[PDB]
Design a protein around this ligand. Sequence first.
Ligand SMILES: CN(Cc1ccccc1C(=O)NCC1CCC1)Cc1ccc2c(c1C(=O)O)OC[C@H](CCC(=O)O)O2
Ligand SMILES: CN(Cc1ccccc1C(=O)NCC1CCC1)Cc1ccc2c(c1C(=O)O)OC[C@H](CCC(=O)O)O2
Ligand SMILES: [Cl-]
Ligand SMILES: [Cl-]
Lengths: 149, 149
Amino acid sequence: SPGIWQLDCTHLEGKVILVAVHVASGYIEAEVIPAETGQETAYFLLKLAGRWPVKTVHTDNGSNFTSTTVKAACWWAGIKQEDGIPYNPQSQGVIESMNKELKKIIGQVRDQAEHLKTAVQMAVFIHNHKRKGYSAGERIVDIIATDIQ
Amino acid sequence: SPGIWQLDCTHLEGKVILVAVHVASGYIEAEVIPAETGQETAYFLLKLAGRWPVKTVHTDNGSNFTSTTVKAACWWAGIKQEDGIPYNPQSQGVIESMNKELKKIIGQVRDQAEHLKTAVQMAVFIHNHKRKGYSAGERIVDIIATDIQ
Ligand SMILES: CN(Cc1ccccc1C(=O)NCC1CCC1)Cc1ccc2c(c1C(=O)O)OC[C@H](CCC(=O)O)O2
Ligand SMILES: CN(Cc1ccccc1C(=O)NCC1CCC1)Cc1ccc2c(c1C(=O)O)OC[C@H](CCC(=O)O)O2
Ligand SMILES: [Cl-]
Ligand SMILES: [Cl-]
């Protein structure tokens, strides 16, 4: 579980927000892209895996699972590329709730930036720092450090 | 020390590579930008601080120290913005060595991507995973987890 991430794609303002969620902690990374291509997804995963020890990524849809560009990046970065079938139905609900939460936060900050990308990064910050008591940012570090040691 | 980062700006292919170094671990994040503006720097810090618990940033030059856009992002993200004066002369040498190391890695991967940005993310990955024995990626997580406890 320390190395398992889930991709998630949501839409706002006619743009796409691509999110990676560290399953065990709820920590997220996100970016705004014009559209969700294999190339955009590949580059996002390359960034993610240089920053965290990404063992497995559950892709967000079948196009990204199929994409040879995505497969090439997963090969490059040593990531096991997996499907995102919610064999546990709870997963489906967790991601939906997360997208709702992120959109709520983006609304709360939207007037503090001209560009959506900036608002999205503010929302990532708020999400990862929120105490629920530990934050998701605290949980991911604890989980990974425990795994190392 | 768990929360101290240093900014660093280097050039390649007529573009700018903006780097943040976690001083205690040598872990890095980096991006390619057309030029090093206050706005680009501010956005980079916003991203960094949503991902790691950034307490203090030593800015890379006086323009970024002065920039009201950079100051606004540091205010937003709760970062103490500081100068980057190398009171310890070892700091200069460490950064110079790191830029040289990064450029070496970029050269080693350069033909594996059309775009410089991709090569830079590959270099970040290699740098952070390199065992010198622990990697910078392991050291940063251990340092931060120890601090949380
Ligand atoms: C310049 N504005 C002014 C602004 C405009 C409108 C409302 C509030 C503000 C304001 O001052 N907000 C408080 C700031 C935000 C953190 C503290 C903010 C900003 C900074 C860096 C960026 C931005 C933006 C943006 O407006 O979205 O957009 C993407 C860009 C990408 C990098 C590049 O392209 O250079 O980096
Ligand atoms: C498509 N190429 C093909 C290629 C071209 C030349 C040499 C090797 C390859 C090749 O297959 N390399 C191995 C791959 C690389 C990891 C495994 C790679 C690539 C993927 C995503 C990107 C890229 C690039 C790029 O070429 O730099 O550029 C930035 C872009 C940004 C996001 C967006 O704008 O969509 O994301
Ligand atoms: Cl955090
Ligand atoms: Cl790593």
